[model samples]
Target: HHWGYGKHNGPEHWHKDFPIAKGERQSPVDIDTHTAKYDPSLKPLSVSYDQATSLRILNNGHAFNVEFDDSQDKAVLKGGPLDGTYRLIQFHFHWGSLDGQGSEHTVDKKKYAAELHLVHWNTKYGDFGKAVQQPDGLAVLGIFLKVGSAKPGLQKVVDVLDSIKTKGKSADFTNFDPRGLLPESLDYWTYPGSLTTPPLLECVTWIVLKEPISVSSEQVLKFRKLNFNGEGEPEELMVDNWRPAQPLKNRQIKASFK
Candidate 1:
């Protein structure tokens, strides 16, 4: 479901429209889950989700902007220098048009249905703004949104997509928990990267989990129903909302289970 702003948003032309992307890190790159420079015998750090830390949901009209108070829960690393407490800062997404093509991450150039990004920050460095400057400052959990049968699994989030249906409209979701949106396993692929947005900060540490969470086409369409163009007024339907993939630039993608 990767729709672009227009013709400029296409895969072949996305970077041209976003020239700054040349310096920023991006994805859809293949992560070798089988090998790495590091020892495979060592176990990756563990992330415990037992305690309820600083988690807040801000319904900022455009989308549910979530902030994680990292003062409490932290991601524990084993061999790497990432043993500090990294907090969840914000959660946003990337989607394509109604036809379900144009996403950045293409497998052998194959496009997926859609994509969701749950952005986080290393609290040890400070808030999101400051963390974005450190090499190992951020971690974004990516879940591929494959179009298919309307499974009950996605109902948890999809049920609420309609709840915030309109521009300038919002509601406090105190009942929501950040854990609900996380992919089940912590076994993930780690890499040095950059933010997918403008200014394209290259200080991000990506932790893309191998397992992908499910989202039905109906659920994707629900997200498609959303619009930065405001609700009800149909001039330009807010359909595809994702950035194109960037370059490799001598960067290496590493995984934990390797």
Candidate 2:
């Protein structure tokens, strides 16, 4: 009934309300390894985040987001294709109803169990709302989640999920440094693309890491317990919230490693 992962308002129907869904530079494209060109010139990413900046976690019906205090330049991301220092604003995840099919972006057509997005905005734009409309306003760092041992810093975020299990719910979640969740290698594939949600703004510069972080199956499957519906509404499991890969069309994916 809503603009969701259901058959009616799913991605295939997204173009009905947001015409840019079909526009060039749409995100979550298949990363064909053979096609991604290795660019030795790409700089290693520089990330500096203050654990104190993590404020809260919310279930917005679409996904669970851990908000940060981006009011100042406390947490910033520079280098790695970014022209200016982008402040960290929030981080979220996209998962599936089942394992092996949750990630928005795939490599060589293979999907992962889930994907994490660390969202940042260019300080030059003043704020996130204003930056969302510009071509280089946002830079999203994506990390794939594969089934393995439980991740270290993730359990802290996971422990708070039950508090925000229902849509429109939120809970205080502070003193968490998202950098601990990142994989060892900073190698990634960079491209210009749009947000994978409503309005589908084509302002994001996607930096998808090549290495996937490990997450135990038990931890990942717990996300399925979250509800897409609010407390009074009939509960709908929140999974498979990922958008299928879009056509790359006239874009080049550059790899930071050889």
Candidate 3:
């Protein structure tokens, strides 16, 4: 059977198939703010995203993502733990079935309603596929999501869940700029980590924001409406897609702010 966020194929079982799951630098580590060393050398994060760069929204049997047109530096993430710049490839979110236990990277052992990941690849590696092999290839900016009033910007993404309810479904979702979904403060905890999903490539530089953005519980219902199964299979609601926190062996989480 293929990999999924179920007991049989969940993160714990992944290491049996992908050895990298047991690798040194894994992601979704619990970020203890009290211990995160604040560094002065880190610069403010600069992000530029154009609404027109969003190409499509798709459900890939796991989570839904908004694909971006990374042909140029049209929508990119700079500074803040990233050397040079990384082109925006796509953005996705992880959530628990309910409001209290969704986020991937916990803060002080506290889970958020959800977590958003803006995936980018380094141009220095020439191509995204090639970049995954290099240690400094990917930069994933993670923003925590709390339950409250609906964020109008994030509502746009939630509105499209109906179009891609089942796995392997996609629809045109242009004119969407993920920048508006960002937290007001770019303060973050940075560390070297790997992909939270299978294949488990350890190429990501995680920049997890200190503050979280609000997304309505009603809106989360829209995401829960999505199915883990393909159109022809017995349906299962997509939920608890987040990985549990991993060991932070030999890693120092540096903070962008004191």
Displacement of the residue 185 alpha carbon in candidate 3, Å: 0.8
List residue ranges in candidate 3 displaced over 4 A. Answer: none
TM-score of each: 0.75, 0.98, 0.98
Tens-place lDDT per residue, model 2, 1-258, is 558888788999999888999999999899999999998888998888753389999999999999999989988888998899899999999998888799999999999999999999999999999999999999999999998899987989888899998999999988888878889988899999989888899999999999999999889978989999899999899999999999999999999988
Please report how far candidate 3 places residue 225 from its true position, in Å.
0.6
Q: After superposition, how far is residue 49 of candidate 1 from its true place, in Å?
A: 3.1
Off by over 4 Å in 2: none
TM match of model 3 to true structure: 0.98
Model 1: pairs clashing at backbone N, Cα or C within 3 Å: 1-96, 1-113, 2-96, 2-97, 3-96, 3-97, 28-105
What TM-score does candidate 1 reach?
A: 0.75
**Which window of 10 residues has the lowest lDDT sum in candidate 3?**
45-54
Q: Write the per-residue lDDT of candidate 3 for residues 121-220, one digit (tens) a residue.
A: 9999877899899899999999999999888898889888999999999999999978779878989889999999988899999999999999888988
State the C-alpha lDDT per candidate.
0.57, 0.92, 0.91
Clashes counted in candidate 3 amount to 0
Against the true structure, candidate 2 reaches a TM-score of: 0.98
Best candidate, lDDT-wise? 2
